[PDB]
Amino acid sequence: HIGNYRLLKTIGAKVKLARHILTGKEVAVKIIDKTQLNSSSLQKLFREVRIMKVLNHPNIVKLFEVIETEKTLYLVMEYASGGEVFDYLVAHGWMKEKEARAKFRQIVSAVQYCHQKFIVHRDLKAENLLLDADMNIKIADFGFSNEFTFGNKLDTFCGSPPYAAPELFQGKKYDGPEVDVWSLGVILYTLVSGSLPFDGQNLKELRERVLRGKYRIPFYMSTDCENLLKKFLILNPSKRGTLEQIMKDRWMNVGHEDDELKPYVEPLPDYKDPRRTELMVSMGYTREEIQDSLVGQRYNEVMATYLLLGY
Amino acid sequence: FPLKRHDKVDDLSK
């Protein structure tokens, strides 16, 4: 038991499935021991939380509440009951292009929206693409993410090798968004084939292959999927397609004649919904503290209840 | 190549 949550079974810092007592809603709670972190780690943890609070997209795992005690930080997250795309791929082998496209339109919307908010993810990979109960994508794990500006190449060469842009294996100060564009190409490849385009016996092999930038196109892959891959997986970062360019690509829009993929528009805030507010008032909250919590984006217990009532 | 998990890495230049 913690705050307004009854903690239930472990599902993954431990991650525990929990129920919000006031709303009865199911959530995933990350339990993080602060004591045993170092300054650097602590700093990155505050950054990760700040980043998660900024992102509000239907295919990004939602943060509901932050609970702090001396020794423990609790992050109350949206629960994605379908598990990782990684384990889905292992169970089903691969996705037919139509299914891959359904996932990949949601992936691309989500990441292009991160970029709109001036956030690079930096660990886009199958394990970080979760699936909710309706088989929608929910992007997770902002542990390597950072804010960026266009007047600033980035400095830190973090990622996961098979998904990492070659400039990262090199020493090379880089434009952040472009790194996520490469990783997205690798994802696309792995959704349609069920295999990774760059690997080897060891990381020195993997590295060499990534830096050559050559990958094999299986014979079943459509011409459109092949041509799309070519816009992501380009060695020179400044000629990789932009995500806005990539949204208009043919493969992305097959079956979407009337509904081309376009950048996500963040909904206006609604902090004064009469239905949710009434319910909360009869739970004993007041309108005044709902307003302060929501307008202040506090992610405290009040804000969490309001959010959970709309989910 | 076969789909498998790799460790995250803080500094891929090594």
When CB atoms are compared, the residue of A160, A171, A196 closest to B1 is A196
When CB atoms are compared, the residue of A89, A161, A195 closest to B9 is A161
Q: Does the beta-carbon distance from B13 to A169 stay under 8 Å?
A: yes
B14: distance to nearest CA of chain A, Å?
7
Write down the domain spans for chain A: 1-79, 80-269, 270-311
CA-based Rg of chain B, rounded to a whole angstrom?
10
Domain A270-311 fold is Helicase, Ruva Protein; domain 3 (1.10.8)
A150 Cβ contact list (under 8 Å, min separation 6)? A175
Residues of B in contact with A161 (CB under 8 A): 6, 9, 12
Answer whether A261's CB lies under 8 Å from A105's CB: yes
Please state which architecture CATH assigns to domain A1-79: 2-Layer Sandwich (3.30)
Q: Does the beta-carbon distance from A161 to B6 stay under 8 Å?
A: yes
Q: Does the beta-carbon distance from B10 to A123 stay under 8 Å?
A: no
Find the closest chain B residue to A91 by CA distance. B3
How far is the CA of A197 from the CAs of A71, A162, A176, A182, A191, in angstroms? 42, 8, 22, 12, 11
- Tokens matching residue A107: 């992936």
Longest CA span, chain B = 24
Q: Does the beta-carbon distance from B9 to A159 stay under 8 Å?
A: yes
Nearest CA to A168 out of B10, B3, B1, B12 is that of: B12
Q: Which resolution in angstroms does this entry have?
A: 2.2
- Tokens matching residue A254: 């097959």
> CA–CA separation, A299 vs A134, rounded Å?
26
Torsion angle in degrees (nearest 10) through CA of A9, A12, A14, A16: -30
Answer whether A107's CB lies under 8 Å from A129's CB: yes
Q: Is A82 labeled as ligand-binding?
A: no
Q: Does the beta-carbon distance from A126 to B3 stay under 8 Å?
A: yes
Nearest CA to A73 out of A41, A44, A39, A45 is that of: A45
A168: distance to nearest CA of chain B, Å?
6
Q: Report the sign of the C-alpha dihedral through residues A166, A167, A171, A176, in that order.
A: negative
Catalytic residue among A33, A87, A123, A259: A123
B2: distance to nearest CA of chain A, Å?
5
Residues of A in contact with B9 (CB under 8 A): 158-161, 164
> CA–CA separation, A8 vs A260, rounded Å?
42
Active site residue A270: no
Write down the experimental method used for this entry: X-ray
> CA–CA separation, A213 vs A233, rounded Å?
7
In CATH, which superfamily holds the domain spanning A80-269? Answer: Transferase(Phosphotransferase) domain 1 (1.10.510.10)
When CB atoms are compared, the residue of B1, B7, B8 closest to A199 is B1
Q: What is the DSSP string of A152-188?
A: --B----B-GGG--HHHHTT--B-HHHHHHHHHHHHH
> CA–CA separation, A117 vs A202, rounded Å?
36
Q: For chain A, give percent helix, strand, coil, nearest 5.
A: 40, 15, 40
